[PDB]
Motif scaffolding. Structure first.
Motif, PDB file in Angstrom:
ATOM      1  N   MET G   1       0.971  -1.269   0.033  1.00 40.99           N
ATOM      2  CA  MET G   1       0.051  -0.026  -0.046  1.00 40.99           C
ATOM      3  C   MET G   1       0.855   1.054   0.042  1.00 40.99           C
ATOM      4  N   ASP G   3       0.465   5.535   0.707  1.00 42.82           N
ATOM      5  CA  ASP G   3      -0.373   6.775   1.116  1.00 42.82           C
ATOM      6  C   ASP G   3       0.217   8.049   0.128  1.00 42.82           C
ATOM      7  N   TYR G  91     -12.009  -0.082   5.970  1.00 41.85           N
ATOM      8  CA  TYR G  91     -10.932   0.305   4.673  1.00 41.85           C
ATOM      9  C   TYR G  91     -11.137   1.406   4.130  1.00 41.85           C
ATOM     10  N   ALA G  95      -8.411   4.173   3.895  1.00 41.72           N
ATOM     11  CA  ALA G  95      -7.752   5.043   2.649  1.00 41.72           C
ATOM     12  C   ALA G  95      -7.983   6.473   2.782  1.00 41.72           C
ATOM     13  N   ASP G 100      -4.916   7.406  -0.335  1.00 43.45           N
ATOM     14  CA  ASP G 100      -4.753   6.725  -1.331  1.00 43.45           C
ATOM     15  C   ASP G 100      -5.842   5.634  -1.340  1.00 43.45           C
ATOM     16  N   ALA G 101      -6.418   5.235  -2.561  1.00 42.22           N
ATOM     17  CA  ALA G 101      -7.241   4.266  -2.588  1.00 42.22           C
ATOM     18  C   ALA G 101      -6.448   2.801  -2.736  1.00 42.22           C
ATOM     19  N   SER G 102      -5.125   2.470  -2.798  1.00 42.65           N
ATOM     20  CA  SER G 102      -4.429   1.578  -3.191  1.00 42.65           C
ATOM     21  C   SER G 102      -4.564   0.338  -2.158  1.00 42.65           C
ATOM     22  N   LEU G 104      -7.422  -0.396  -0.967  1.00 44.78           N
ATOM     23  CA  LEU G 104      -8.501  -1.011  -1.233  1.00 44.78           C
ATOM     24  C   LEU G 104      -8.412  -2.137  -2.352  1.00 44.78           C
ATOM     25  N   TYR G 152     -13.799   7.456  -1.320  1.00 46.69           N
ATOM     26  CA  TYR G 152     -13.417   6.106  -1.133  1.00 46.69           C
ATOM     27  C   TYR G 152     -14.473   5.190  -1.085  1.00 46.69           C
TER      28      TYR G 152
END
Ligand SMILES: *[C@@H](C)[C@H]1/C(=C/c2[nH]c(/C=C3N=C(/C=C4\NC(=O)C(CC)=C4C)C(C)=C\3CCC(=O)O)c(CCC(=O)O)c2C)NC(=O)[C@@H]1C
Ligand SMILES: *[C@H](C)[C@H]1/C(=C/c2[nH]c(/C=C3N=C(/C=C4\NC(=O)C(CC)=C4C)C(C)=C\3CCC(=O)O)c(CCC(=O)O)c2C)NC(=O)[C@@H]1C
Ligand SMILES: *[C@H](C)[C@H]1/C(=C/c2[nH]c(/C=C3N=C(/C=C4\NC(=O)C(CC)=C4C)C(C)=C\3CCC(=O)O)c(CCC(=O)O)c2C)NC(=O)[C@@H]1C
Ligand SMILES: *[C@H](C)[C@H]1/C(=C/c2[nH]c(/C=C3N=C(/C=C4\NC(=O)C(CC)=C4C)C(C)=C\3CCC(=O)O)c(CCC(=O)O)c2C)NC(=O)[C@@H]1C
Ligand SMILES: *[C@H](C)[C@H]1/C(=C/c2[nH]c(/C=C3N=C(/C=C4\NC(=O)C(CC)=C4C)C(C)=C\3CCC(=O)O)c(CCC(=O)O)c2C)NC(=O)[C@@H]1C
Ligand SMILES: *[C@H](C)[C@H]1/C(=C/c2[nH]c(/C=C3N=C(/C=C4\NC(=O)C(CC)=C4C)C(C)=C\3CCC(=O)O)c(CCC(=O)O)c2C)NC(=O)[C@@H]1C
Ligand SMILES: *[C@H](C)[C@H]1/C(=C/c2[nH]c(/C=C3N=C(/C=C4\NC(=O)C(CC)=C4C)C(C)=C\3CCC(=O)O)c(CCC(=O)O)c2C)NC(=O)[C@@H]1C
Ligand SMILES: *[C@H](C)[C@H]1/C(=C/c2[nH]c(/C=C3N=C(/C=C4\NC(=O)C(CC)=C4C)C(C)=C\3CCC(=O)O)c(CCC(=O)O)c2C)NC(=O)[C@@H]1C
Ligand SMILES: *[C@H](C)[C@H]1/C(=C/c2[nH]c(/C=C3N=C(/C=C4\NC(=O)C(CC)=C4C)C(C)=C\3CCC(=O)O)c(CCC(=O)O)c2C)NC(=O)[C@@H]1C
Ligand SMILES: CC1=C(/C=C/C(C)=C/C=C/C(C)=C/C=C/C=C(C)/C=C/C=C(C)/C=C/C2=C(C)C(=O)CCC2(C)C)C(C)(C)CCC1=O
Lengths: 160, 169, 67, 57, 169, 20, 161, 160, 161, 161, 160, 161
Positions: G1, G3, G91, G95, G100-102, G104, G152
């Motif tokens: 992940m 940020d 989650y 995020a 950051d959506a990573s 997810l 998100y």
């Protein structure tokens, strides 16, 4: 049913069903008319059982039908009676199957999660099942009453 | 289908390489073996029917159960189908001999062969033994005749034998 | 079930660990009877020093009623 | 006798019919019970002495 | 949210329908006077049985805007008007909406929110509906009030109305 | 949302144009 | 992940570059948003159970979903569904904190659609429940942090439909 | 405390306290007086907090103090307020220590189990703590209010 | 663990004999007790949580044990204590329903007294609470069934004491 | 898995309905045949090794399958085939007791075809083996139990085919 | 016994025992009369059962009594008949228990290794228990024959 | 895996045949090559690290692959890549010793393409690196041993095609 639980146990040890499991299934089988009689008696008088149990519950626990209580209001009380109806039906399934698996998998696994999310006092749910057990036992003979009371007690314990 | 030259070219194109000394030597080896390969194919053409018949007869002498009840060569229908399969193997082995590459066997004989025989209940082991019998007959024939190079002859048959047979060790 | 209460000391060969490892080294634990042969072999062949073995739960000389 | 006019007048949309599990099915029963709400209980936390009233069993 | 009782031909649905007949002025005045009647003839509030945190911010805003803006916000809630606060109100559960109206009434009684116009008196139809509601049981009363205030605010799709209650200047 | 920028593609270095 | 800071660093490192003015501007903007993100995340951690409760009551209860034959019927399936809603809310809060959506994609949406299709879990009902969570969270946390949480949660919804 | 928590977080990775942890401990030590006074403000007015919050709760949740409730009667009202005072005490410990751990390790580990055995609804205990939070916040400055609200909200979250 | 059936089986097999006259007699006695045994087991299972609840209410609550300083103080100590009583009831019910106490040795008293000595849980209050539990149980089933339950709960208490 | 009783109960529970007369008569049918199933299961459990042995000896022995080059050649593969037959016989008995083939569909057939095509296990020969098991069992347990066991062995064969 | 295994299975899930288990305990307790009847019949008739079973086994398996067999001669015939008597003992132990557990704890857990270390063909021992079965199944009533046949068949299957 | 001797053994076994003249001839040919195979294996084992180092310097260093954005950028990826080259050299030596590519089919090329595609490893670059390894190994072990080792390294390369 009992057959499925015994099968799962016998397969978990890579063995055929034992003499004890076979005799248990056989007893549940041949003595299977009383189970269906009990189920028919519970299904015939579900209206009265649930209504009398709900009346008894609201008498014992008026707080749940008082301001701040989950069952306060016509709609909330209706849904409470519906929940009691659910549990009576499940008790009949358990009686018929000679096992508590269907009750467990329909209305007990995670039941505490559901009722904690809904705000419902679960101990009062067990009390409503107690009232239903009392009424149903009043509606049946002694041996049938004991057989049904065992499964009612299972349900009550799982919410107590 | 890929022959020896196509296999070499594929190997060299994979890396974007021009043909070097080793490539030219391998091509030279194939070209010099070409006459012997052609002669072996012609000899097989001159005896294919008798090779198949004699190999089948030897196989059914070695495993008599095949032509007895419950044997997979039992009844004329199955016997004819078995001789047909032997003919297939010989024709494609001749192809592989000419090409100096067994990819023709992989593409058009072996891929899905185990599945077909399993589906029909055709026993693989006796078929592999029959392939080996035909191989030995071809080798003896080549030795008898005025052929100089005969080492390549075994390559296709052995390939089929290795590709189709069960793994024991 | 029969349960032993095994005490063992496990030394550290091949590695100088820097995290806390005292819990793994000298330990006392309950082991089911059925797994004690395998566990004895595993502790030994690892370099361990099994100080003590006792029958915490169960009786000796029991022919039936052990599970 | 069966009269189709009565049924035509009595038409109800299918999606509006109650099905199993709908709590609406227990509206009549809930009304009949008519649960009794407790009286407004008069409690003053100010006038409670915690130390004395709490049980000392 | 919780299933609403809309049309059943019983005292609770009948009173709910009657409350829905009343104008925006009649309905808003009726709930104000019902609030004044809460605790003696109507059922008390139990806001701990509602996730009132969801309304907290909204209530803060009402307690910050000016008295005219406060009255206009309440009128907008009663008028089914499209405003951000009306949509916020509509997104809540019935218990939260009813507790929100309760807190509005408490603030008005305490002065923090614009009070009712001086010397206001309830109308005829509104007073009749209020008397009916006073005649019902506590559970029936809470159901009736819940269904009374559930349709306030703005919800997309639905639309209508022509009367409106702008202000009291 | 998880695929890194350098994985499976050409990463061109961005440089300000020389005429700037 | 990754940020927001790690995303900036990864783009720079993939270029082999030191952090120039624009990268520092992105870092400064994220630092500026950090306090708002932390406040919103604290509120959601405080009211997670209530948020899920209200979203379920708004979107799923008193419908065919909960009645016999629906996917939420039975206490087991009810518990599984509200557990899933708790997962999605947790989650989404992660995020939002990271910007950051990573997380997810790496932890939630990977194989989730195939999971729900193999289970017979209705996707539209789940999306509606998640959107109800979005509205409840917006009303609880504000309109700015509400907007970020909405970004998100809509990301989670986008990976399910 | 913050020092104990930092020590365990450092030992989890088998190292020394990072300069960030040490500087946070420095800031906590230096700001010591502010929380040493926030705890005093909560402590000195404890009876006001508990009783005002209890009245606000019984207005919030009239069912519990109603017949059949968990707290009905003067006796159980008093013991419920006793629990409120206990939890305010734990919150003061929390604001003093800078960490939510002593609150967790005293009043929130197995709290659901104990109150299940006793019958208390837990949403209402969370509401009691929330009312205590509001009444306490009204007695102090906004920044002090937020500093104490961190721990009050932690207790609320570990209850409902 | 051993039941009466397995106890006599074990004795006969240790001495390597068939089921003898005394063995038949003791099996017969167990068979004659195996109706009140099962009835008491069912009744105890029906309302065990209430049994422990009332015992704790009448024997432990609102005393120095639950006050600051006592060993039940803390939401965690209370939980530990109530589960200990619940386990005591379950295993005593197993013991009653089998006509033996080897299960109590092999699944309860495996180092329990030493553990309580190490951890400071009182060895007197536990026996008092178990007295309350057996009292409620006997008043809830019957004189002879209650006698059996009291015998086995006293076996547990002696193992603790 | 589901047995006949659980099949009825699930059909009633998916609609939220109590058991009506038709469900009761289906349960009566299952109870009527349960004695037969228990006796057949007992015979098969006693003789499982012998059914497998005789079915192998009547279908696979002294054939290409066991000779060099066959999939039953070498002792590891021979033991593998006997092991698979043990599974098939045991799960056929399980299903027969349950009255439903569900356990076969879930434990045996969900993956087995891909497994056998991966390993190169011939399905013609194994179907012949399972049919031989069918006749041997039909000889042991009689006419009615023979046909009932047939049903589930044929089920395994059809799932393989 | 059936009671022991019911209790351990319950304690696995940490429950008080479910209705079917207690029902089976009741049934087995009440049928103790018939089970002890069968056990006494087998005990009193043990020598004849063993003798007939051995004669029919040896007519079925004349190799084990031939030179080279494990039971060759009269002393080894005595040992083999003694093993037949031991497993008849275990059958009588099982029938009075309602479960197979004693038979496995004494005679079947390790039997294969024992006979291999002895060279005894364990399938011939299976045949010996079979012959015991078809002798005992004519010496008692039709239902008693089957009630013992359950344990005979379990032994045969576990020795196959 | 399957070497020349084991391949001969399998061919004989699947026909239930004892080894005939031709099989012994194949074994003798492999024995004749054994000395050369062992010599090459010794030399490569002594020089595996430097073989990889020179191959990397020839094919990979000072290119976009090792620059920022390239798949060998960062120390973890560089270490992984030289580890992969170690893998290929060691397994090619194994195949050369065995005189058979089956080990490559079993534990080198199985799922390798999917592995590299999922990781994003560039196939063409690794093919060129393996070619460089072949060239360096040839320059170390002479023409004949280089021809054999090249057969196996080219087998790996064709697998990646
Ligand atoms: C006789 C039945 C035929 C036969 C069988 C045979 N099977 C194997 C190997 C395997 N069989 C299985 C089977 C299952 N997997 C499961 O999950 C289930 C339970 C429902 C089953 C039945 C498996 C997993 C294997 C592979 C085991 C392994 O990893 O080695 C073999 C051996 C094949 C081999 O290459 O070793 C054989 C011989 N073969 C015949 O020819 C008979 C007609
Ligand atoms: C009555 C004794 C108590 C009571 C009940 C009550 N329940 C609800 C709401 C729901 N109850 C359920 C329960 C079940 N669904 C299942 O599938 C199963 C097993 C088959 C069970 C037991 C559900 C799912 C709901 C949600 C509503 C819906 O059905 O969609 C309420 C209403 C809660 C609310 O706020 O709406 C009530 C009142 N309440 C009490 O106080 C009694 C102790
Ligand atoms: C000759 C006077 C007699 C004779 C002998 C004979 N037969 C074979 C070989 C085969 N015979 C068969 C027969 C059949 N196939 C079928 O499907 C059926 C049913 C219609 C039959 C009867 C087959 C398949 C063969 C070939 C395989 C084998 O060897 O069994 C031989 C040997 C031939 C050889 O070239 O080696 C001989 C000598 N058959 C007669 O009908 C005459 C009475
Ligand atoms: C003879 C040595 C063995 C034997 C053979 C046998 N084969 C079949 C049937 C088929 N054989 C094949 C094989 C191929 N088809 C192809 O295209 C190729 C690739 C070039 C091959 C090798 C197929 C596909 C079939 C089925 C379709 C068809 O007939 O064309 C049989 C008949 C099987 C039956 O009974 O249905 C037989 C008898 N039998 C033996 O016993 C020998 C081991
Ligand atoms: C050094 C001053 C003296 C000395 C040291 C020495 N220690 C060991 C082995 C171990 N030491 C420990 C101690 C700890 N491990 C921990 O995790 C902690 C708690 C945080 C402590 C205090 C342990 C557990 C071991 C064994 C396990 C391991 O080492 O990983 C040795 C023995 C070395 C060996 O392998 O035999 C030695 C030499 N010895 C001296 O003579 C010095 C005076
Ligand atoms: C009040 C907000 C709610 C409520 C509470 C309530 N609790 C009890 C009884 C007890 N509560 C506790 C709790 C604690 N003891 C501790 O040491 C700790 C850590 C600080 C906690 C949290 C205990 C142990 C008891 C038992 C009695 C005793 O304290 O000695 C009651 C009384 C129940 C009864 O039957 O008497 C009540 C009423 N009830 C509500 O309805 C409110 C929501
Ligand atoms: C309640 C009447 C009294 C009481 C109880 C109490 N016990 C502990 C801790 C433990 N209790 C056990 C229990 C068992 N060990 C066994 O082998 C069995 C069989 C299943 C049982 C029932 C154990 C293992 C422990 C230690 C580990 C654990 O935490 O579970 C405590 C906790 C004390 C502490 O946390 O320091 C308490 C409170 N305490 C009283 O005051 C009552 C008299
Ligand atoms: C001789 C020392 C002992 C003996 C042997 C015996 N074996 C069989 C039957 C078979 N033997 C095998 C063995 C193998 N098949 C293989 O693939 C291999 C691995 C290379 C071995 C060792 C098989 C599979 C069979 C089955 C028949 C067949 O080939 O299809 C028998 C006959 C048993 C019967 O009733 O069919 C016998 C007699 N018997 C003894 O008493 C000696 C100790
Ligand atoms: C300087 C202090 C020391 C030194 C350096 C040195 N390095 C190389 C070659 C390379 N260095 C790297 C290192 C990295 N690549 C990365 O991606 C990272 C982190 C982002 C690092 C640290 C690499 C990959 C190479 C290979 C060449 C290439 O860039 O493609 C050399 C050249 C060695 C040679 O023979 O070519 C040198 C000189 N050397 C010293 O002696 C100093 C101690
Ligand atoms: C028990 C219990 C609860 C129940 C709680 C309950 C029952 C709560 C009920 C609360 C009630 C009845 C609230 C009503 C509030 C009305 C207001 C603020 C209207 C003001 C009107 C104005 C300003 C109008 C002014 C006007 C303007 C300007 C004009 O234009 C001209 C005139 C007019 C007068 C119209 C909960 C739901 C909390 C939880 C569950 C639970 O069990």
């Amino acid at each position: 049913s009992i057959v499925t639980k015994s099968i799962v146990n016998a397969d978990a040890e890579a063995r055929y069903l034992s003499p004890g499991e076979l005799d248990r299934i056989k007893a549940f089988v041949t003595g299977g008319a009383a189970r269906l009689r009990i189920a028919e008696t519970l299904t015939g008088s579900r209206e009265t059982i649930v209504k009398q149990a709900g009346d008894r519950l609201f008498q014992k626990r008026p707080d749940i039908v008082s301001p701040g209580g989950n069952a306060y209001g016509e709609e909330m009380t209706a849904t409470c009676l519906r929940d009691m109806d659910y549990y009576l039906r499940l008790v009949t399934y358990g009686v018929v199957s000679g096992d508590v698996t269907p009750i467990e998998e329909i209305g007990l696994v995670g039941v505490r999660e559901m009722y904690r999310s809904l705000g419902t006092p679960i101990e009062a749910v067990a009390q409503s099942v107690r009232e239903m057990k009392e009424v149903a036992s009043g509606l049946m003979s002694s041996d049938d009453a004991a057989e049904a009371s065992a499964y009612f007690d299972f349900v009550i314990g799982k919410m107590s | 289908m890929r022959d020896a030259v196509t296999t070499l070219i594929k190997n060299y194109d994979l890396t974007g390489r021009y043909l070097d000394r080793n490539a030219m030597d391998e091509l030279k080896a194939y070209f010099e073996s070409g006459s012997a390969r052609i002669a072996a194919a012609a000899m097989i053409n001159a005896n294919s029917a008798t090779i198949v018949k004699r190999a089948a007869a030897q196989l059914f002498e070695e495993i008599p159960e095949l032509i007895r009840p419950s044997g997979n060569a039992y009844t004329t229908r199955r016997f004819s189908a078995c001789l047909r399969d032997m003919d297939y193997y010989l024709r494609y082995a001749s192809y592989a001999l000419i090409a100096a590459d067994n990819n023709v066997l992989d593409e058009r004989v072996l891929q899905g062969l185990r599945e077909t025989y399993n589906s029909l209940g055709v026993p693989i082991g006796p078929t592999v033994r029959g392939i080996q019998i035909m191989k030995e007959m071809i080798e003896a024939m080549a030795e008898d005749s005025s052929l100089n190079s005969t080492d390549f002859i075994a390559s296709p048959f052995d390939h089929m034998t290795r590709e189709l047979s069960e793994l024991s060790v | 079930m029969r349960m032993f209460r095994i005490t063992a000391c496990v030394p550290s060969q091949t590695r100088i660990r820097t995290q806390r490892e005292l819990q793994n080294t000298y330990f006392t634990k309950l082991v089911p009877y059925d797994n004690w042969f395998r566990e004895q072999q595993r502790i030994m062949k690892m370099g361990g020093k099994i100080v003590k073995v006792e029958l915490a739960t169960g009786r000796p000389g029991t022919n039936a009623g052990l599970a | 006798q069966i009269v189709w006019q009565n049924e035509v007048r009595r038409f109800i949309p299918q999606e509006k019919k109650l099905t199993a599990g709908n709590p609406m099915n227990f509206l009549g029963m809930a009304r009949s019970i008519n649960p009794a709400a407790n009286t407004i209980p008069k409690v003053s936390a100010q006038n409670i002495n915690i130390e004395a009233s709490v049980p000392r069993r | 949210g919780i299933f609403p009782n809309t049309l059943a031909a019983d005292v609770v649905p009948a009173t709910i329908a009657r409350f829905s007949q009343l104008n925006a002025e009649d309905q808003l005045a009726l709930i104000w006077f019902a609030y004044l009647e809460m605790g003696k003839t109507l059922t008390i509030a139990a806001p701990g049985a509602a996730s009132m945190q969801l309304a907290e911010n909204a209530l803060k805003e009402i307690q910050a805007m000016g008295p005219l803006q406060q009255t206009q916000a309440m009128c907008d809630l009663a008028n089914r008007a499209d405003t951000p606060l009306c949509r916020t109100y509509a997104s809540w559960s019935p218990n939260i909406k009813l507790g929100f109206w309760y807190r509005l009434g408490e603030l008005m009684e305490q002065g923090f929110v614009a009070p009712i116009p001086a010397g206001y008196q309830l109308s005829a139809n509104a007073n009749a509906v209020l008397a009916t509601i006073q005649g019902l049981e506590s559970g029936q009363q809470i159901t009736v009030l819940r269904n009374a205030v559930v349709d306030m605010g703005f919800t997309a799709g639905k639309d209508g109305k022509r009367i409106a209650e702008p202000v009291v200047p | 949302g998880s695929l890194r920028e350098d994985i499976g593609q050409r990463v061109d270095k961005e440089v300000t144009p020389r005429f700037v | 992940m990754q940020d927001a800071i790690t995303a900036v660093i990864n783009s720079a490192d993939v270029q082999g570059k030191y952090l120039d003015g624009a990268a520092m501007d992105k870092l400064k903007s994220y630092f500026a948003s950090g306090e708002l993100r932390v406040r919103a995340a604290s509120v959601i951690s405080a009211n997670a159970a209530t948020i899920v409760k209200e979203a379920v009551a708004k979107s799923l209860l008193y419908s065919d979903v909960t009645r016999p034959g629906g996917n939420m019927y039975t206490t087991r399936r009810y518990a599984a569904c509200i557990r899933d809603l708790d997962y999605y809310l947790r989650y989404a809060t992660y995020a939002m904190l990271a910007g950051d959506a990573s997380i997810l994609d790496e932890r939630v949406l990977n194989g989730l659609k195939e999971t729900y299709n193999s289970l017979g879990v209705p996707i539209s009902s789940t999306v509606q429940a998640i959107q109800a969570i979005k509205e409840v969270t917006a009303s609880l946390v504000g309109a700015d942090a509400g907007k970020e949480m909405g970004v998100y949660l809509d990301y989670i919804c986008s990976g399910l439909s």
